[PDB]
Design a protein around this ligand. Sequence first.
Ligand SMILES: C[C@@H]1C[C@H]2O[C@@H]2/C=C\C=C\C(=O)Cc2c(Cl)c(O)cc(O)c2C(=O)O1
Ligand SMILES: C[C@@H]1C[C@H]2O[C@@H]2/C=C\C=C\C(=O)Cc2c(Cl)c(O)cc(O)c2C(=O)O1
Lengths: 214, 214
Amino acid sequence: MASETFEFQAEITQLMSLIINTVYSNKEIFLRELISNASDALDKIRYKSLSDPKQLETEPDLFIRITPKPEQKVLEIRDSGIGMTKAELINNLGTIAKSGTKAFMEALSAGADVSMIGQFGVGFYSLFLVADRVQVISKSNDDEQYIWESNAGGSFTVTLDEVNERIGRGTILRLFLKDDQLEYLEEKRIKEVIKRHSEFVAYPIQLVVTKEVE
Amino acid sequence: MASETFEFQAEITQLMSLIINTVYSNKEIFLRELISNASDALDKIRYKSLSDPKQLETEPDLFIRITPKPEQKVLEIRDSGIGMTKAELINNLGTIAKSGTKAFMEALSAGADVSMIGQFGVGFYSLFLVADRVQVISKSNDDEQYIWESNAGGSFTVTLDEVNERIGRGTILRLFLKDDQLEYLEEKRIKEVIKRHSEFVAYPIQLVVTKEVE
Ligand SMILES: C[C@@H]1C[C@H]2O[C@@H]2/C=C\C=C\C(=O)Cc2c(Cl)c(O)cc(O)c2C(=O)O1
Ligand SMILES: C[C@@H]1C[C@H]2O[C@@H]2/C=C\C=C\C(=O)Cc2c(Cl)c(O)cc(O)c2C(=O)O1
């Protein structure tokens, strides 16, 4: 109840406009970047749990889950990783500069391939290749569940979560797919994209598929 | 935020103890009864929509969805039917007598088969054959989302929903399966049970299955 608006650090706004507007051919790379963030987030909690085992109690199962929601033309990528607090969502996703933000844009301009985005540490923004709106729902052991939302505009919002399912711990990336990128809602397409660019992932990757009983 | 307790009409409490304690052999009948309630609830909104089309706008897709959640040993049966208001959950699920409640118990005592429960209009309670706890999450166009919860005790609770996913319209029956009835979480078992006792259902029945990418 009651949002909170924040301005995006100027360069992040540029990058976003760039990503969401590049005619780029190979938009499927966004899944690789998101699954990668999910994996690192899971490494984080695993490592932290080394000296603080109780930390995994909020969600003992470590996994990455992709859930397509046709009716709402939404694609969700979830992980039971370390999660983010209200402060971290604000920091990590928009108000703090980000080292490679400008460097990547400069590299892109020089001819670099969009797929290099992840090497600049800003792969998250690659989601705008297939979605024009996103909701990052997170729950860290250190805070409540919050929704961070953006549509590539110069500003984003953070609202305490009182509308989504409770996630024990972790993050959900709710991607509102563009009208021409609804192929990522299909199991085959998803399955194949995950196969080629994500072969060495330490955690199970679950695909949630809704099938009408024969 | 803030529950509200209510006592169960005495006979419903009896029936529940009976169901949750009957050694009965054919516990799988609960799915047939629940899918049946789901169907009737969908008929209700379809019919009402005949003269009030805007009523389907909250959720244009009419369906029944079964979603097993292993980690939490939970089984969910959802429908985008008419849904129930706070008042209706209280009325329909516990505080109002219910014509066949006593008649069915008398019939059972005479030797009747538990599967007749649905003919007495109290099939919902058959869920206690496989679950020792249940949450009925509902959203009617006429109210907010609420959670009705019970564990066959003499009382139940109703809380405004600020923790579950938003359902456009309809009801979710979250069944917390008993430790020895976890077979209903399996796709095959579910698939076969649905096949035998639910052949003439007017709406699509979707099974949500989580598969780890090969
Ligand atoms: C802050 C934590 C943990 C970090 O060390 C991990 C690696 C990358 C983080 C990138 C982010 O900016 C946030 C993020 C994104 Cl974008 C995502 O799609 C999935 C996630 O699970 C996280 C996250 O929860 O990240
Ligand atoms: C009140 C409405 C609509 C009624 O006319 C329909 C038929 C049966 C109703 C039985 C109930 O007692 C509530 C109920 C149950 Cl138990 C269920 O498992 C699923 C449902 O969708 C409803 C419901 O929403 O019911």
